[PDB]
Design a protein around this ligand. Sequence first.
Ligand SMILES: Nc1ncnc2c1ncn2[C@@H]1O[C@H](COP(=O)(O)OP(=O)(O)OP(=O)(O)O)[C@@H](O)[C@H]1O
Length: 497
Amino acid sequence: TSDPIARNSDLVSLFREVAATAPERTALSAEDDRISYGRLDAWSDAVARTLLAEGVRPGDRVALRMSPGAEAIVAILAILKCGAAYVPVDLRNPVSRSDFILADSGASALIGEPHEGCAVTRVVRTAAVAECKDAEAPGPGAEDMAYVIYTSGTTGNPKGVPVRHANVLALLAGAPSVFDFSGDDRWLLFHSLSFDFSVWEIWGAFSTGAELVVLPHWAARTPEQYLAVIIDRGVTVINQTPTAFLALTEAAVRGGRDVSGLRYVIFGGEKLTAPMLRPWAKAFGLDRPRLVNGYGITETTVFTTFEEITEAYLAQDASIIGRALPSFGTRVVGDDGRDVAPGETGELWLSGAQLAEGYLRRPELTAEKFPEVVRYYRTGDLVSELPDGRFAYEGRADLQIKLRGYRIELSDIETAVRRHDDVVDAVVTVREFKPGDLRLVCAYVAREGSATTARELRNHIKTLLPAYMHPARYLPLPGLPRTVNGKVDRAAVARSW
Ligand SMILES: Nc1ncnc2c1ncn2[C@@H]1O[C@H](COP(=O)(O)OP(=O)(O)OP(=O)(O)O)[C@@H](O)[C@H]1O
């Protein structure tokens, strides 16, 4: 085969082949500074020698604390070329999360700038990366780790997820079943290196010989700045949370921007419902760019299913995540541990080449979350199958509560609220009204240009759910408060109430 993706079994070999084949092509750009594949390849080789001198060796985990930028990408390639895995540290982490990630992962060095109180003292500064810029071992194998990304810590300590070269290759080999990507694309490098969206941005581009456009620091703050850069730099592929897309749409329409240079907008991270999509579709259509909903998790290498948005999508009121990539086997599993009848909701279980090998130093959790039956991963997500094989995303599987004599599926209530045409987000929790008097309440976000009242939402909910599932109060917020991992800050919602 001529295809470098099919022919290579690790990311370093893939990169080197793509670079050597056409090394003058642009791999990465920062403003007008264009770094060719050849330049990037030599630069990262020089940085790798620097890491070898700090003792980095195959199997090491090297911390990375940098903004997404050219230096950060060189540092990733350098770490990988040493046969090591990178452990990205979000610059905005609470100090305690960064402290835990570094202790947990046993990081033996850090590239970039250490956080305040950082226990890793073996450091290669950003300046030392820049110094290698224009200079002149077997490398990793399929089964070696490429990175360790940590889950958000919703349920307990952040879980460290080691992802292998073979895992990433399997995702990259699967992408062309949904996407038409080529070497002429320009991908915006946007997300924190600590998010696995970043992994997709980087390798989506490198695996096809495409260019990674770096979002400049000056443009990091507003969607107007964001649009200005993507349009000016000829970006063709962007990756967004549905929430970011709301603000993007609003800035594009109001600013009269031309978005039609984009070929794909790819969503991940959150439910995507039609009220979030209809205004873009109204202004711009669904062809240029194509919009593609994506569902995935760190444990199964970034993305699992995709659904390209169509007119039909806009005409229904659920979040449809679509069909699994070709590497995956799937089950939808009841509470008794057995499959469910097609059409009914159960826990999504996943099998295949994209599954990680388990958590880092968590034998107990790994046995639980990665059962043999064929090895599976339990997502902790509820889904239901459509009569095509497409999945609808229902909610998290751990949101059943006991209240006032009922078991209550909060995810069901959230889903019912999100069916409303003028709602774009919602979270249902329990709060105290009078001592010993706890009730369901719902904080929600109205779509731009609307103002749905508590009375109207109550009226909508009573057509869908039994009275024991009715939120007792509604609270309109300008947006839901979020954590650094973007997970909705439930301490903050409490305070809002
Ligand atoms: N496209 C999507 N639609 C809806 N929800 C999503 C989507 N993508 C991710 N999520 C939610 O985010 C979760 C991934 O978050 P993360 O890896 O931080 O795990 P967590 O459960 O939040 O944290 P922890 O596992 O540490 O308790 C998914 O299981 C899913 O519930």
